[PDB]
Amino acid sequence: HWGYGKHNGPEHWHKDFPIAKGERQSPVDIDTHTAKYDPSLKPLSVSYDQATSLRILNNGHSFQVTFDDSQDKAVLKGGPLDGTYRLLQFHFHWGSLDGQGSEHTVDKKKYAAELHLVHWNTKYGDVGKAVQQPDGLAVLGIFLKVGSAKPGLQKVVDVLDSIKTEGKSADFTNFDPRGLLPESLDYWTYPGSLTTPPLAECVTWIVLKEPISVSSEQVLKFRKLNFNGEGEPEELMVDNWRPAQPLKNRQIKASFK
Ligand SMILES: NS(=O)(=O)c1nnc(NC(=O)C2CCCCC2)s1
Ligand SMILES: [Zn+2]
């Protein structure tokens, strides 16, 4: 089964998921000097006030916080998007060291981690149908750098001890994902894919230009999670990031000058 190790990592994924070598794979390097400001791009609308978080879960590749997406409660609109995209879950990708961990890169710079808030287009009715559409999902990507603590992340960090290994989950209600956002909603956007299998080419990527800072203690707690399930040889959940993929016939647009 797929993972991030030598024998099951990103270089192997194409064998089970041939779209791994497709025309709109993610992540990508964002070359800031080649990205073009698109004045027709609207501001992002991040409407998270009614977000209803449900569970936090270690799925063996990351940890994710899931939300009630059965109604328009936490939605992403605007920017490059047509229509309404419901927040389903967020998760992170991170490194074994502070100089790697992000999936997208900016002028080849790797951040310590990357937060993905995964949303799906309500015109497709459910996320499984949305994954089958080229405009089915919108992932809001936010870089993490190590510096000062992010207070809105602490509640996540506080609970990771309870989901150390693959398959463990915990109640994670009343979590406000607005606490994970940077000040600026300036973004780059491009059409891409899920960065984990099945690598479906269904994502409008919206990557914020402003990172959030998290503390060394916060990221260290990410790195104490396990890829393995309980009772198996302990393999720390670190470096669960896919590297940048070929941009191919795509233009990255910037919402800002
Ligand atoms: N790293 S990422 O591009 O944000 C992602 N890679 N696979 C992702 N799968 C999902 O979100 C789903 C969750 C539930 C049902 C379908 C899909 S999200
Ligand atoms: Zn992700």
From Swiss-Prot:
Residues noted as binding substrate in the record, renumbered to the chain: 195-196
Site (Fine-tunes the proton-transfer properties of H-64): 4, 59, 64
Transmembrane segments: none
Domain Alpha-carbonic anhydrase, chain residue ranges per copy: 1-254
Details of cofactor binding: Zinc. Can also use cobalt(II) with lower efficiency, but not copper(II), nickel(II) and manganese(II).
Disorder noted: Osteopetrosis, autosomal recessive 3: A rare genetic disease characterized by abnormally dense bone, due to defective resorption of immature bone. Osteopetrosis occurs in two forms: a severe autosomal recessive form occurring in utero, infancy, or childhood, and a benign autosomal dominant form occurring in adolescence or adulthood. Recessive osteopetrosis commonly manifests in early infancy with macrocephaly, feeding difficulties, evolving blindness and deafness, bone marrow failure, severe anemia, and hepatosplenomegaly.
Protein name as annotated: Carbonic anhydrase 2
Organism in which the protein naturally occurs: Homo sapiens
